[PDB]
Design a protein around this ligand. Structure first.
Ligand SMILES: OC[C@H]1O[C@H](OC[C@H]2O[C@H](OC[C@H]3O[C@@H](O)[C@@H](O)[C@@H](O)[C@@H]3O)[C@@H](O)[C@@H](O)[C@@H]2O)[C@@H](O)[C@@H](O)[C@@H]1O
Length: 110
């Protein structure tokens, strides 16, 4: 089941191994266009300490440059040691329409 987080205008939906989505909510409905940050492309897992990365590509065309959106996902230790499972921590956008999502998860903790 997909992880969700709202930051200002955009709500972000992370569907692990499928795609990443960005869209606007009003009340509790998706008002408008749904944008794709990217579709699942690759993943690397390392274990025994721990590391996990995924990449997502060919999302919606960027109006700034006409290039598809692209995203990478970092997976880091949930340092709150919480009890609600994984969560979207940050979304960063270091180049127009290129994103780095950071997910926190108890499974990546030492
Ligand atoms: O073009 C690259 C960016 O595209 C997308 O962001 C577009 C803008 O989104 C937000 O504004 C849209 C909404 O803002 C509201 O305040 C109202 O004005 C609405 O009518 C309007 O639809 C806002 O975040 C802007 O700063 C964005 O430019 C995203 O995909 C971005 O990640 C891209 O950078």
């Amino acid at each position: 089941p997909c992880l969700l987080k709202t930051k200002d205008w955009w709500t972000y939906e992370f569907c692990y191994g499928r795609h990443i989505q960005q869209y606007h909510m009003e009340d509790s409905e998706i008002k408008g266009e749904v944008l794709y940050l990217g579709y699942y492309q690759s993943a690397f897992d390392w274990d025994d300490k721990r590391y996990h990365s995924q990449t997502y590509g060919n999302g919606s065309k960027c109006d700034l440059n006409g290039r598809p959106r692209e995203a990478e996902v970092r997976f880091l230790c949930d340092e709150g040691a919480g009890i609600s499972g994984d969560y979207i921590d940050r979304v960063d956008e270091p180049l127009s329409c290129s994103y780095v999502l950071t997910i926190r998860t108890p499974r990546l903790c030492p």
